[model samples]
Target: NDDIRQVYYRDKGISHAKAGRYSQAVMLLEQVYDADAFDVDVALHLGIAYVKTGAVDRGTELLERSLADAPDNVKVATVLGLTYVQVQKYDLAVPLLIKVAEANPINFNVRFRLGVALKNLGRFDEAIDSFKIALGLRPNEGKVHRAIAFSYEQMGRHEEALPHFKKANELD
Candidate 1:
């Protein structure tokens, strides 16, 4: 009976999530988690639902645990990495983002965010490399140029940033 109840809640939770009713999804998924925390699907859904409902810390904690258990879950890695960057926790962001960006060579956002985290961490060279990769993936994206320029500037290589600044100016 309890198993049936948990299963019912899990289905309802997933249905709510699929419908973009994140607050409702979180409510049901929270119950599911209490009943079956070991279910990877429940953990993933509940973690994402918490994020969608603005419970970022709770979401990140759950997502981090999920990532640790299933290292190949690129979706969680991307989500957790983005959250870390948004929270300005670049120290934590860099490694996770590096994993994602490296795995996804053409994913512009992942590469850009990786550059940002690396830049914030004072690893300007690495930041520029990531930015360059993004630029390669999408040449017309002006922000990528600006990001590269900023990293170069931070490294006291204003001349290097100069070229990118002009490129950004035109790309815009």
Candidate 2:
């Protein structure tokens, strides 16, 4: 009965999460998690819920635990990398974002976030490369163009920055 109840709560929690009721989701998911801490899906959702509720430290802990338990879990890695970025831990974010970017090349957002991490660390050239890759995957995207322009400006390549800046404004 306890196990069944936990499953029920988990299901309800995930449903609430999908419906954007993160606070309600966290309450239900916490109950299920207290019953069992090893469910990867539960941990991922609960971790995100915790972050949404402004308990980022708790979210990071849960995400870290999930990653340690499932090293190949891309979703866990992605969420944790994004969380690191939110906390301004760019160094910690890079490797994780790179892993997800390599694993999911079609995900331009992951590549863009990798660029963001590199940019935050002052690695302008590398950030530009990542943003270019994202641009290749998603051409004519205004944000990607803006990111490329910013990276160029940071690198003191004002001439190179101009075209991308123009394109970004045009697209926007």
Candidate 3:
């Protein structure tokens, strides 16, 4: 039956995906989708496989569909937000990231990403606030410092940007 075939292929696809064999994962998972498993885990895996293979849009569609079933999943929200960034969909990434950041304030990674999204949206002050919040959660994170520096630069504060970069690189 098609259902059995879809399950078999999806299981094989997941094995390939775990091994980072994206192309093989795509082949198997695409077939699983062909067998009509769009509402299942196979669809999500297909999207992630596309991302692994550098096919952002195709992968994004699958991921978005998966989101319909799992809206509050932080991992999915985070990855989907990142994928939007990859495709230069800054407008979309902003609110999605903001929602995630607001929901998970102690998540420095999400905060940094929100900073980036705000920076891209030309909301420099808010971007700075986002980075600052991240730094508060992870003071020694050089990357967070660097993102703060970028927010400074975007706000026409090159002098401010320099210190963060220097911190990011550390003293020789």
Q: By lDDT, who's the top model here?
A: 2
Model 2, which residues run further than 4 Å from truth? Answer: 18-20, 35-37
* Candidates arranged by lDDT, highest first: 2, 1, 3
Prediction 2 TM-score vs. true: 0.88
| Number of colliding residue pairs in model 3 | 0
Q: Model 3: residues >4 Å from true position, as ranges?
A: 1-5, 15-21, 34-37, 67-75, 102-108, 136-140, 156-162
lDDT of 3 by residue, 51-79 (tens): 97989877898788777778877656766
- Residue 149, candidate 2: Cα error in Å is 0.8
Candidate 3, residue 53: the lDDT equals 91
Give residue 82's lDDT in candidate 1 (0 to 100).
85
Model 1 weakest lDDT span, ten residues long: 34-43
Clashing pairs in 3: none
Model 2: per-residue Cα lDDT over 1-172, one tens digit each: 7888877999999788767799998999988885244888888888988998999989899999889888889989988988888899999899899999989999887888889889889999999999989989988899989988998998899999999999999998
TM-score of each candidate structure, all chains considered together: 0.80, 0.88, 0.72
- What lDDT tens digits, residue by residue, belong to model 1 across residues 1-172? 8999988999999889777788998989888785234766677778878887888889888888888778887767887788889889999878788888778878889899999898888899999988888888998889889989988988899988998999999987
